[PDB]
Amino acid sequence: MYKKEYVIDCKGHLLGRLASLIAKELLNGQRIVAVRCEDINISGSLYRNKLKYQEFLRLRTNTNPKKGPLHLREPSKILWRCVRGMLPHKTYKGQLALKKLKVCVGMPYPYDKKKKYVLPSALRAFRLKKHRRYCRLGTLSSRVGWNYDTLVKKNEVLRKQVSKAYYKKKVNNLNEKKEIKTEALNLINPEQRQVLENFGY
Amino acid sequence: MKTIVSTQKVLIPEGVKVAINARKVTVSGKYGTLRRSFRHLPIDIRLNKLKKYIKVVMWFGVPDSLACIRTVCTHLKNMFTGVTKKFLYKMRLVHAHFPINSNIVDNNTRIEIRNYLGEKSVRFVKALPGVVIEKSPNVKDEIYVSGADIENVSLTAALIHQSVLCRNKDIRKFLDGIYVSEVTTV
C-alpha cells in the first residue's frame, strides 16, 4: 500500500474474499485497477447462483421502477457493487475511497503492458475443497443478459499471441546479457571478484 | 474415517494403443479413436506400456469417494471394447393396425418415420457423431444402431424410442412403438 497504483488480474479469485481485501486498501488510500473481471469464481453451483440473481431481479420500487435497485449485469459492475457494499459510501471519505477503484473486462491498452499481481488469500485453488461446486461469473452474466462473452475471448487470443512474441524476445535478450556478464568477471581485480563471490552475486 | 490406500487393476487387450497424461485418456484401435477426460475426481493413475494393466490408486479416501474407482475402471474397459468390437443395439418396431414406415437417408444417418398410428406426418432423429443406422438384412422389422462408443449409440437408440411415445390413451392397450430388444457387439 505504498505504491502509486496496483494492477490485479482477477482470473481465479473468489468474489467475496477479493472484494473484502480490496475495500481496506481503498480505505487506507491506494489506487487499484482490476482486470479480467469475467473470470471471477463463486462458491456454489451455477444453478444455485442463477436462482440468487433471479431473487435479486424481482425486487424493485413498486410505484416507479426508474428509481430503486438498479440491476447491473456486466461482470465488472458486479464486483464494483459488491465492493460498494463493504464501504461506508454515504459519507465523504467513504465516497472518496470508492472513486479510487477502476474495473475492466478483458485487458485494455494501458494495463496490458503493466505488471499484474495476485492475492493468494482469495485464490480458489487454496480455499475450496476439490469436491465442492463452483461457477464462473461470465457464464452467469450471459445467462441474465450481458451479450459480450464471446468477443472478450476473441480479443484475449490476440493479446496472448502478442505477449508470446514479446516473451521470446525477452528470453533472447536475457541469455545474451548472461554471456556478457560471465565474460567480464575474468577482467576485474581479484578481490572484487572474491567479494562478489562471497555474497552470491 | 479415512483409508490410506486403495487400488484396482485393468488389463489392456492385444490390439489397442493407449495414452494417459493428466487424467486425460486416448485409446486407438481398428475402428477409430476415442477421447475422454477425468479431471473431476482425485486419482493418480499409472500406465505400464511394456506390460498391460493401467492402475488406479487413491490416497486418503472416504466411502463416497472410494465408489468412483470401479466406475472409472468400467469406463476404461468399455472404451477398450469399443475400438476392437463395435457396440450393437437391435431394435424392433411393433404395430397393431397401422404398419410403421422407416427410411434411412444421408449416408446411413437420419432415420425417417411415417404412419405411426396413421398420422400422415413425418418424424426425424439424427444420430450422434460416430453412430450409423441401418435396417436388418434378415428380419422384417429390425433396425441396427451401432459403432465404437457405448454412450453415443445407446443414447441414439434412446432418442429413437422416445420419438414415438403414445399420447393421451391407455398405454397398457395401445402398445405401438419402437423398442430395444438386444444388446451385443459386431
Partner: protein, 105 residues
C-alpha cells in the same frame, strides 16, 4: 543521486477508537516493512514528523511540521500508537509521515 533519506515511511490511519467512540488523544500509524508485533517494538522510542504544505507564506516558507513520539504497539500486526504535541487534523488520514531515527541506541 542527492538528498539522502535516513527515515522509514509511514501512513497515518485514524484515531484510537472503538465502534462509535473516538478518543483523539492517540493516533494509529502503519510502518512500511513492519507486520508483526515483535518487530513493531523495535521502534518504540523514535521521533515522528508530519510535514505538509500551505498556500500562503507564514514565516518566509510554505512548509510546517507537527512533532510526535512512538509510545507502544497496537496488537499482533505491527501497528503503533503515537502521541503528538497537538491533535492531528482528520483531513490527513491517508497522508505520509516520517518515522525518524534521531534518538539512536
Amino acid at each position: 543521486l542527492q538528498a539522502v533519506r535516513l527515515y522509514e515511511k509511514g501512513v497515518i490511519l485514524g484515531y484510537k477508537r472503538s465502534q462509535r467512540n473516538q478518543d483523539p488523544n492517540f493516533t494509529l500509524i502503519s510502518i512500511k516493512n513492519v507486520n508483526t508485533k515483535k518487530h513493531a517494538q523495535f521502534y518504540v522510542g523514535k521521533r515522528v514528523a508530519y510535514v505538509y504544505r500551505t498556500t500562503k507564506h507564514h514565516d518566509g516558507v510554505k512548509i510546517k511540521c507537527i512533532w510526535g513520539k512512538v509510545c507502544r504497539t497496537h496488537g499482533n500486526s505491527g501497528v503503533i500508537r503515537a502521541k503528538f504535541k497537538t491533535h492531528i487534523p482528520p483531513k490527513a488520514f491517508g497522508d505520509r509521515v516520517r518515522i525518524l531515527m534521531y534518538p539512536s541506541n
